[PDB]
């Protein structure tokens, strides 16, 4: 389950704010994404995040 | 920029901040209407901020201009990060001492060349600390061999390493797309690395000298 994976910033050095499902908190939180090599637990909005991972 | 120093208000006139509701990448002004940055900094709704020092406070020397076009290199590979370069056309031309363009290189720089890297990225190797003002770093260009030894099978002909093998001084999240200027010419674009300021893991930059033709022609036909 990719929704249970920790957020992945990646090697690139941008500072792009994305969302990830935090199964421990039971909610989608923000994190800094570097701009490349995103894993699946990386969403552009909280709504996308909840729709895909909500309740995982 | 980890291990750097405060540049000083408007001492790096060609440095721009790419804003999408917040600063997410840097860029360099190459003429009154064009900016060069990294391809991985591609985002919709980009606003370019010129003449910035403290990115959180309006100080009076700024010019915020929206991008009208964003051209990512046709061969950019998001997996290998090869050809990590992008051109952004400003909706209107900037008014050029605090805002100025940087010259494109006539030739490639050699290992050992000292360059100035700048940005508003994270200043901590372990942790998070985003600055208000522009940070600067002098780092030498490293040899292709050591670069390739640090990142086995990841360095292409279009990338170069710069920094210190000891670690402690490096570019970091939020610096992407920014300039690496050596001898007054734009030689690199902040691109990627393994963590920030780690020992034996210098930063990797887009080698600008290989794209000068593409840049000049692309600017002219758009
Ligand atoms: Ca400002």
Swiss-Prot record, chain A:
Keyword 4Fe-4S included in the entry's annotation: no
MF terms in GO: calcium ion binding; molecular function inhibitor activity; potassium channel inhibitor activity; protease binding; serine-type endopeptidase inhibitor activity; sulfate binding; zymogen binding
GO CC terms, sorted: extracellular space; serine protease inhibitor complex
Keywords: Disulfide bond, Pharmaceutical, Protease inhibitor, Secreted, Serine protease inhibitor, Signal
Localization (cell): Secreted
Keyword Disulfide bond in record: yes
Any Gene Ontology biological process: negative regulation of serine-type endopeptidase activity
Disulfide topology: 3-53, 12-36, 28-49
Record site: Reactive bond for trypsin: 13-14
Domain BPTI/Kunitz inhibitor stretches: 3-53
Biological function: Inhibits trypsin, kallikrein, chymotrypsin, and plasmin.
Protein name: Pancreatic trypsin inhibitor
Natural source organism: Bos taurus (Bovine)
Residues of the full protein shown: 38 to 93 of 100
UniProtKB/Swiss-Prot annotation, chain B:
InterPro entries (UniProt xref): Peptidase_S1_PA, Peptidase_S1_PA_chymotrypsin, Peptidase_S1A, Serine_Proteases_S1, Trypsin_dom, TRYPSIN_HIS, TRYPSIN_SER
Location within or outside the cell: Secreted, Extracellular space
GO biological process: digestion; proteolysis
Catalysis performed (reactions): Preferential cleavage: Arg-|-Xaa, Lys-|-Xaa
Organism, as annotated: Bos taurus
GO CC term (a single one): serine protease inhibitor complex
Primary location class: secreted
Keyword Transport: no
Domain of life assignment: Eukaryota
Name of encoding gene: PRSS1
Location of the Peptidase S1 domain: 1-220
Catalytic residues as annotated in Swiss-Prot or TrEMBL: 40, 84, 176
Keyword annotations: Calcium, Digestion, Disulfide bond, Hydrolase, Metal-binding, Protease, Secreted, Serine protease, Signal, Zymogen
Protein name: Serine protease 1
């Amino acid at each position: 389950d990719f929704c249970l994976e920790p957020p992945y910033t990646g090697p690139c050095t941008a500072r792009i704010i994305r969302y990830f499902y935090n199964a421990k908190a039971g909610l989608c939180q923000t994190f800094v994404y570097g701009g490349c090599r995103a894993k699946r637990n990386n969403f552009k909005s909280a709504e996308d995040c909840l729709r895909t991972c909500g309740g995982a | 920029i980890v291990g750097g120093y405060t540049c000083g208000a408007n001492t790096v006139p060609y440095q721009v901040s790419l804003n999408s509701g917040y600063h997410f990448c840097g860029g360099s002004l190459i003429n009154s209407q064009w900016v060069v940055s990294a391809a991985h900094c591609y985002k919709s709704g980009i606003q370019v901020r010129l003449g910035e020092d403290n990115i959180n406070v309006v100080e009076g020397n700024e010019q915020f201009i929206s991008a009208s076009k964003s051209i990512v290199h046709p061969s950019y590979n998001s997996n290998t990060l090869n050809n990590d370069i992008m051109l952004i056309k400003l909706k209107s031309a900037a008014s050029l001492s605090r805002v100025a363009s940087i010259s494109l290189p006539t030739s490639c720089a050699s290992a050992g060349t000292q360059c100035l890297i700048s940005g508003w990225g994270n200043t901590k190797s372990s942790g998070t600390s985003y600055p208000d003002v522009l940070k600067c770093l002098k780092a030498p260009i490293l040899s292709d061999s050591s670069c390739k030894s640090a990142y086995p099978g990841q360095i292409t002909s279009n990338m170069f390493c710069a920094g210190y093998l000891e670690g402690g001084k490096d570019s970091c999240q939020g610096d992407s797309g920014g300039p690496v200027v050596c001898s007054g010419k734009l030689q690199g674009i902040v691109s990627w690395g393994s963590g920030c300021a780690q020992k034996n893991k210098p930063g990797v930059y887009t080698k600008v000298c290989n794209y000068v033709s593409w840049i000049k022609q692309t600017i002219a036909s758009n």
